[PDB]
Design an enzyme around this catalytic site. Sequence first.
Site, short mmCIF file in Angstrom:
data_model
loop_
_atom_site.label_atom_id
_atom_site.label_comp_id
_atom_site.label_asym_id
_atom_site.label_seq_id
_atom_site.Cartn_x
_atom_site.Cartn_y
_atom_site.Cartn_z
N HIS A 163 -1.44 -1.97 13.60
CA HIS A 163 -1.32 -3.18 12.79
C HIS A 163 0.13 -3.47 12.33
O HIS A 163 0.35 -4.51 11.73
CB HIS A 163 -2.31 -3.21 11.61
CG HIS A 163 -2.09 -2.18 10.54
ND1 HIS A 163 -1.06 -2.32 9.63
CD2 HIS A 163 -2.85 -1.13 10.20
CE1 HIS A 163 -1.18 -1.29 8.81
NE2 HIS A 163 -2.25 -0.55 9.10
N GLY A 214 2.62 0.22 1.86
CA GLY A 214 3.72 0.90 2.55
C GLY A 214 3.40 2.34 2.95
O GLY A 214 4.19 3.00 3.64
N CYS A 239 0.91 3.16 4.97
CA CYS A 239 0.30 3.18 6.30
C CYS A 239 1.12 4.03 7.26
O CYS A 239 2.34 3.97 7.21
CB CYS A 239 0.09 1.77 6.83
SG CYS A 239 -0.92 0.72 5.76
C1 LIG Z 1 -5.86 -2.45 8.65
C2 LIG Z 1 -5.44 -3.29 7.47
C3 LIG Z 1 -6.04 -4.52 7.22
C4 LIG Z 1 -5.60 -5.32 6.18
C5 LIG Z 1 -4.57 -4.88 5.36
C6 LIG Z 1 -3.98 -3.65 5.57
C7 LIG Z 1 -2.93 -3.11 4.62
C8 LIG Z 1 -3.43 -1.99 3.72
O1 LIG Z 1 -4.63 -1.71 3.65
N1 LIG Z 1 -2.47 -1.35 3.02
C9 LIG Z 1 -2.63 -0.32 2.06
C10 LIG Z 1 -2.91 1.01 2.38
N2 LIG Z 1 -3.17 1.98 1.50
C11 LIG Z 1 -3.16 1.65 0.21
C12 LIG Z 1 -2.90 0.35 -0.28
C13 LIG Z 1 -2.89 0.03 -1.66
C14 LIG Z 1 -2.61 -1.24 -2.07
C15 LIG Z 1 -2.32 -2.24 -1.15
C16 LIG Z 1 -2.32 -1.97 0.19
C17 LIG Z 1 -2.61 -0.67 0.67
C18 LIG Z 1 -4.41 -2.88 6.64
#
Ligand SMILES: Cc1cccc(CC(=O)Nc2cncc3ccccc23)c1
Lengths: 305, 305
Positions: free
Chosen positions: A41, A143, A145
């Site tokens: 992604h 951030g 990921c």
């Molecule tokens: C596969 C996918 C789909 C849609 C959006 C995303 C981004 C995502 O989930 N990021 C984050 C990952 N861990 C903690 C997070 C906490 C707060 C905000 C974002 C966070 C990934």
Amino acid sequence: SGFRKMAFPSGKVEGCMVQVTCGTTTLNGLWLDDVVYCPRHVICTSEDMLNPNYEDLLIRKSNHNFLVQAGNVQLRVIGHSMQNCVLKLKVDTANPKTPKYKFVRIQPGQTFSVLACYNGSPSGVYQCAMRPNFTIKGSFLNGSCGSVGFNIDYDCVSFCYMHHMELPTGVHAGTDLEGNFYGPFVDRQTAQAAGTDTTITVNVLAWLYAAVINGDRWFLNRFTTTLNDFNLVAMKYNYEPLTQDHVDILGPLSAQTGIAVLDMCASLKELLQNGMNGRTILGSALLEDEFTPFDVVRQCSGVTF
Amino acid sequence: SGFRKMAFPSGKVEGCMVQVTCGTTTLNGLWLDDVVYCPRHVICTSEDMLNPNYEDLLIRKSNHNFLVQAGNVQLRVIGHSMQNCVLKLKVDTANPKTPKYKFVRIQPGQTFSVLACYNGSPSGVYQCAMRPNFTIKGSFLNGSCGSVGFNIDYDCVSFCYMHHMELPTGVHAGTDLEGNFYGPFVDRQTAQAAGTDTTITVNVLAWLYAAVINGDRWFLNRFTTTLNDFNLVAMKYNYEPLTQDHVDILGPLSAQTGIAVLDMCASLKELLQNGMNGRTILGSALLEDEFTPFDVVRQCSGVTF
Ligand SMILES: Cc1cccc(CC(=O)Nc2cncc3ccccc23)c1
Ligand SMILES: Cc1cccc(CC(=O)Nc2cncc3ccccc23)c1
Ligand SMILES: [Cl-]
């Protein structure tokens, strides 16, 4: 003595953490030999995430669109490919700090250390378990990921998780290092609800054995139970079914303490029924389920107290 | 989202762990530049521990009596000296993996990461706090002596603890890296015990702020209290006195959540008098006190090292 939620030393993993950038998006990557593994992604926008066509987004990219940064040194991408939900970026330099490593797919109940990273820089290390609903109860901000989950038994780093997303309930979803998601989750912004979570029964039992090894016997009782009767009671408190494989896996702990698995099962039954009555087991007022039988043997002494 | 007991990445510390052997005794040492720091009781036998004259035991040793092993490479000791309860072994080779470091003495309530080691080999990493009674609730077995406690301040590893002994209650005692013990402990086999422990009030409040940041608001109330009225209630429940310095240190968390410090004190007073009433805060049925206000800010903002 003592029993802490213990993570593996993260040094072998820290030396692999790089920053991956594709346009406006910046996340983490794992640099092993001449390959950087990161969530696919990274090539998406927030509009793209609703119904992304990864093959179509990726075909529009060249090697030089991917910026890879290992500390203050930029790595040159010489190739790219996709394997399930992971982007494998072939780089021009092999990681000199590449440890002995393996990619392992873990099962629910299995625990691991998470090296949380932001911009290819390690922030912290904690322990967690793959929940029966295939989510992890991590600690991750935007951030994070590409931060990885791993175990380090016998000087070898077994990579088992790559963080990809945070579900609406605050729990996290990710993949093994071959891009296969854990659970029925997809890397799409869609209605994906974590299924109802259950308590990892084999782990709770392992922790009760850890408590006996460390001197706590207040919860033990004169009773025993059949495996089937224990399961009927446990499912009523949202506990995972205890199987014959779990009974066998608990064998060494049962022999070390002298408490049979189905006798420890009667203790758990009573514990679920009565609660703690103002007492604690290894400094906890709850039944801890994020310690495996392997972790208990790893951490605890060989001599019972 | 998520809130885990999080340790600093241990990599900068792992590169400093060596094995120190003096006769039959084998423990861990910290190799920084050309000096190996380890517990001075390494020179003692079990009969010596009952009443050791460290200066007299040490004067009978030569450099070659100390075997230092950095992985599978033996270091040759070219000098030795004592500083309080730490043995400083001058070695011929400077540690190429020596990070930027300082020796800091921490105060009770302050948390740190412990890299537990056995035979100069890191086993695990965990987070713990210096209890108000100056003990640490660690997880250590025989052979863990010389394991260190540290924090990372941007790029600088601040060494704050070296493990020396386990008290009869299973809790742990050690020194700062200059050999000064934390608490009224001595490095000798004699009757020693942990004084009555208290709860770190500023840390409980910090973790209540972490819960509010992560979506738990059930414990919040419309009430406020004076600092003096809160301190009467804290003394009753074996909580450390909350001072004006603690109120100031909680300022940023108070501003982020919109809950004044004395407003969060009124929530804590209600939890102490009534309990949790079957509920949990960040997956805990107990009021967690091993997270400082800085730890809460660092984990909820994602600081990297
Ligand atoms: C596969 C996918 C789909 C849609 C959006 C995303 C981004 C995502 O989930 N990021 C984050 C990952 N861990 C903690 C997070 C906490 C707060 C905000 C974002 C966070 C990934
Ligand atoms: C200064 C001193 C006096 C007397 C004894 C010692 C040795 C000691 O306590 N070592 C240990 C440290 N941590 C965990 C241990 C667990 C089991 C056995 C030993 C352990 C030191
Ligand atoms: Cl002395």
